[PDB]
Design a protein around this ligand. Structure first.
Ligand SMILES: C[C@H]1O[C@H](O[C@H]2[C@H](O)[C@@H](O)[C@@H](O)O[C@@H]2CO)[C@H](O)[C@@H](O)[C@@H]1N[C@H]1C=C(CO)[C@@H](O[C@H]2O[C@H](CO)[C@@H](O[C@H]3O[C@H](CO)[C@@H](O)[C@H](O)[C@H]3O)[C@H](O)[C@H]2O)[C@H](O)[C@H]1O
Ligand SMILES: *[C@@H]1O[C@H](CO)[C@@H](O)[C@H](O)[C@H]1NC(C)=O
Ligand SMILES: [Ca+2]
Length: 496
């Protein structure tokens, strides 16, 4: 459950936040497969509540009504079709599994669901699964409100409602089975793994009990004995009775401290500087590399809804973001996930963003198709960070340097550092307020390399900066603190 199951040479997955199945299908064929991406994180494929107040918010997808594959992203056929086409081009699908709960207890009974399934939060009735009052932790929770009131009580964090969301009784075999029934349907369809939503609110043991019920991956696409990839969403910063390590026996876990610290380092908050990244990784108190799923921002914290809050870098901070994703895709620690978002009318007031609820681009609630502009960018308000030259190229950079050790580190004691990945790649960063110009040891073979940040190698020529490596591996670099992208990256496959 620790292995991604991506095919040889692909090292990252991209979160295509709120995309339709049909658009993801096309994206696998026309860009992801050709570009060397390993897989895609899809938004919950199961029927959810249709919330109109606010109008169709993004979080309404974390409020399940049944396990029918019917949502704003498409129906069951389109979902199947998507997994098949993507798999056929070597791009895996990972489902966002919302199994800790159903919808909010305050939600009104009726058929206001993405598939028309009837549900009644009041009476605990979800006939479409089916579930009844006997399947929730109402009687198990010991708080006066029934919700989670204190996070220093590991019991209540698991047994009570997360801000009103009906908590499933995961110790019951009936519930575990309905859930495994759901997940096995997806595995047999072809999905390669799952993102376990709100895993902090589930008992490690209950999760393990559900995993034991899961099938091996579809043998038409995966070698016999392949276990699904499991990554547990667990927000664990400092001091909390619950540790992300309690979940190692089930699979990987989201390391939220990663993006948080990278954000404060790159923003240079409270005196932090890049030279401190020398021992980036476990040395910084992060989980072991083989259990970590890393990222700079997520659909949650990019809009102040998760961990990290303000330090987190997003597409809104374009310049520092590219540099952050660059360092991430270049560093060996963890398995990397790339964010791909959409624009929303950010409206700050007294510090908070009153539009952090805004759902994906749409027309009367109908999500907009992703349009591809002539320069490869996206229209209809989709940001498509994965299509940005600097990002897409670092994705490939990771593939090329895969397996290569961390070496030839350089830092000026401030904010300009550089390091290499064996003899397959090298990257340099200038985050100081003054130009950088020096000769570093790259441990790379002599030759002429195309800088993949400022450009692309295109048949015998570089469309951007060019670096020259001497016989002793040395090479000169020069980056103005005023450059569009203050960092340079070259690799074995960008050599002329
Ligand atoms: C939200 C976060 O809380 C903890 O995270 C805590 C953490 O444990 C604690 O230690 C400290 O660091 O603060 C964190 C922030 O709450 C968990 O540990 C972590 O797993 C969880 N995040 C996952 C699960 C949910 C829940 O359904 C999703 O939420 C998402 O869906 C929810 C359900 O529609 C949304 O609530 C929404 O619906 C509720 C229904 O009763 C409303 O009461 C609420 O006001 C409304 O915002 C939420 O705003 C959104 O972010 C989210 O996309 C997904 O990533
Ligand atoms: C590289 O570009 C130059 C023109 O800038 C051209 O003369 C040369 O032949 C090109 N090399 C290749 C291999 O296309
Ligand atoms: Ca729970």
């Amino acid at each position: 459950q620790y292995s991604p199951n991506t095919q040889q040479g692909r090292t990252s997955i991209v979160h295509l936040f709120e995309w339709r199945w049909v658009d993801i299908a096309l994206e696998c064929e026309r860009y992801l497969a050709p570009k060397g991406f390993g897989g895609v994180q899809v938004s919950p494929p199961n029927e959810n509540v249709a919330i109109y107040n606010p109008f169709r918010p993004w979080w309404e997808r974390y409020q399940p009504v049944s396990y029918k594959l019917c949502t704003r992203s498409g129906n069951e056929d389109e979902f199947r079709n998507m997994v098949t086409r993507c798999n056929n081009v070597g791009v895996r699908i990972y489902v966002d599994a919302v199994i800790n709960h159903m919808c909010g207890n305050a939600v009104s009974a009726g058929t206001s669901s993405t598939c028309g399934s009837y549900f009644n939060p009041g009476s605990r009735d979800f006939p479409a699964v089916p579930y009844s009052g006997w399947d929730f932790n109402d009687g198990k929770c010991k708080t006066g409100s029934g919700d989670i009131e204190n996070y220093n009580d590991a019991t209540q964090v698991r047994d009570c409602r997360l801000t009103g969301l009906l908590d499933l009784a995961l110790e019951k075999d009936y519930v575990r089975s309905k859930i495994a029934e759901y997940m096995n349907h997806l595995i047999d369809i072809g999905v390669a793994g799952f993102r376990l939503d709100a895993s902090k609110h589930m008992w490690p043991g209950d999760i393990k009990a559900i995993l034991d019920k899961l099938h091996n991956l579809n043998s038409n696409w995966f070698p016999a004995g392949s276990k699904p990839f499991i990554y547990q969403e667990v927000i664990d910063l400092g001091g909390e009775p619950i540790k992300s390590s309690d979940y190692f026996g089930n699979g990987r876990v989201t390391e939220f401290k990663y993006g948080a610290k990278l954000g404060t380092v790159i923003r240079k908050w409270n005196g932090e500087k890049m030279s401190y990244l020398k021992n980036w990784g476990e040395g910084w108190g992060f989980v072991p590399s083989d259990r970590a799923l890393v990222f700079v921002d997520s659909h949650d914290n990019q809009r102040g809804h998760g961990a990290g809050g303000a330090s987190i870098l997003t597409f809104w901070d374009a310049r520092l973001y590219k540099m952050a994703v660059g360092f991430m895709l270049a560093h060996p620690y963890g398995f990397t996930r790339v964010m791909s978002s959409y624009r929303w009318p950010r409206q700050f007031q007294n510090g908070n963003d009153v539009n952090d609820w805004v759902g994906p681009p749409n027309n009367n609630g109908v999500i907009k198709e992703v349009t591809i502009n002539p320069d490869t960018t996206c229209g209809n308000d989709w940001v498509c960070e994965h299509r940005w030259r600097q990002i897409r190229n670092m994705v490939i950079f990771r593939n090329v340097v895969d397996g290569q050790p961390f070496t030839n580190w350089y830092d000026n004691g401030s904010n300009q550092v550089a390091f290499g990945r064996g003899n397959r790649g090298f990257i340099v960063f200038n985050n100081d307020d003054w130009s950088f110009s020096l000769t570093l040891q790259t441990g790379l073979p002599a030759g002429t390399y195309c800088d993949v940040i400022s450009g692309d190698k295109i048949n015998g020529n570089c469309t951007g900066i060019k670096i020259y490596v001497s016989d002793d591996g040395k090479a000169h670099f020069s980056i103005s603190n005023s450059a569009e992208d203050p960092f340079i990256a070259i690799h074995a496959e960008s050599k002329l």
